[PDB]
Amino acid sequence: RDVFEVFSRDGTPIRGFSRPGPGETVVLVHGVAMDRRIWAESGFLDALPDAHVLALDLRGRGESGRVGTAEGHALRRYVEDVRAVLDRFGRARYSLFGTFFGGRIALQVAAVDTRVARAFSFCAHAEQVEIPEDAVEEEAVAVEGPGGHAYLRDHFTGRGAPPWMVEACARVDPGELGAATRGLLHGSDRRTERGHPDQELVLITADGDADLAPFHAGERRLGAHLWLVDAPTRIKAAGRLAEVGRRVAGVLA
Ligand SMILES: COC(=O)C[C@@H](NC(=O)[C@@H](NC(=O)[C@@H](/N=C1/NCC(=O)N2CC[C@@H](C)[C@H]2C(=O)N[C@@H](CC[S@@](C)=O)C(=O)N[C@H]1C(C)(C)C)C(C)(C)C)[C@@H](C)c1ccccc1)c1nccs1
Ligand SMILES: [Cl-]
Ligand SMILES: [Zn+2]
């Protein structure tokens, strides 16, 4: 593996690693309370034997630049972070894969960047959502305070999240957990669009998902393909991420 640095539109440095391979170039986008280490820890990276893999730390996570403001964590800024990675490696075609809010980011990159040939959204759909301002602000307060890592650990543990997902929370600065949560009130509620007719768009979730309706709506509206994994909830579906990587490798082959 090699490390890289690029700069987002707003000057934020975005750091990541490149795992060379002769195959398709795949760009991995983690979720809010994660960093780039989840790709190896989940077994997703091992599932792609041939791909050239690019894995970034989003702004404010891991080795990337600090942000510490709500608007700095707007969805459009994450999109700019990913597009900067696409620039650095200079390809005409990329396949994007994102977990949870990372999936929403990957879909939005696909909407605006014609270099995205495929986008996979793991446990996030593409539809408009109603975000309660009160509840999100309350969650921001819970996660940014001294008890914030414990709050996330206890909740993810109680909902059956894999250990790597529980453990990743404690690697995120509490201030960036709060800012990223508030950032959701700056654009993340809108639906995503199809970028080009030839794009391959895939949504993945638990067959037990209590709200599959918006995933079906992406099938109809975007022509997306819906993949299911055996799990009673979205969070527990994260235990199947390596298996999903094997299915991605089949598509890339
Ligand atoms: C059934 O499974 C779930 O719905 C939980 C699942 N969340 C989601 O999929 C989506 N969000 C939501 O649905 C909803 N958001 C929420 N808070 C914003 C937010 O998300 N977070 C803030 C903190 C961060 C870790 C992340 C998160 O994770 N919060 C859990 C709670 C974690 S704790 C303790 O266990 C969460 O959801 N809190 C809700 C409420 C506060 C409204 C109760 C709405 C308002 C967007 C509808 C995310 C992907 C999203 C989609 C579209 C637009 C914006 C966000 C998880 N993803 C990762 C780990 S759990
Ligand atoms: Cl997330
Ligand atoms: Zn801590």
Q: Describe it for me?
A:
By secondary structure, the chain is of the alpha/beta class. It has a single domain (2-128, 187-252), classed as 3-Layer(aba) Sandwich (Rossmann fold). It contains 10 helices and 8 strands. It has helices at residues 38-41, 75-89, 101-112, 133-144, 148-158, 163-168, 174-183, 213-222, 234-237, 241-252; strands at 2-7, 13-19, 25-29, 52-56, 94-99, 116-122, 200-206, 225-229. An 8-stranded mixed sheet has the order 1-2-4-3-5-6-7-8. Strand 3, helix 1 and strand 4 (52-56) form a beta-alpha-beta unit. Helix 4 (133-144) packs across helix 5. Bound molecules: Bottromycin A2 derivative, chloride ion and zinc ion (ZN). Residues 31-33, 100-101, 104, 124, 129, 131-132, 135-136, 139, 143, 152, 155-156, 159, 181, 184, 188, 234-235 line the site of Bottromycin A2 derivative (MQZ). The PDB classes it as hydrolase. Keywords: Bottromycin, RiPP, Epimerase, ABH, hydrolase. The assembly is monomeric. Structure of the Bottromycin epimerase BotH in complex with Bottromycin A2 derivative. The protein is BotH.
**Strand order, biggest sheet?**
1-2-4-3-5-6-7-8
Sequence of secondary-structure elements: EEEHEHEHEHHHHEHEHH
Number of domains: 1
Largest sheet entry: 8 strands, mixed
If you consult CATH, what is the topology?
A: Rossmann fold
Helix count, DSSP H or I runs of 4 or more residues = 10
- What is the architecture at the second tier of CATH? 3-Layer(aba) Sandwich
Q: In the CATH hierarchy, what is the superfamily?
A: Alpha/Beta hydrolase fold, catalytic domain
Name the shape in a single word. globular
- The structural class is alpha/beta
* Bound heterogens, unique: Bottromycin A2 derivative, chloride ion, zinc ion
Query: What share of residues are in beta strands?
Result: 15-25%
Helical percent range? 25-40%
Question: Could you tell me the radius of gyration in angstroms?
Answer: 17 Å
Can you tell me the CATH class? Alpha Beta
Separation of termini? 22 Å
By DSSP, the count of extended strands is 8
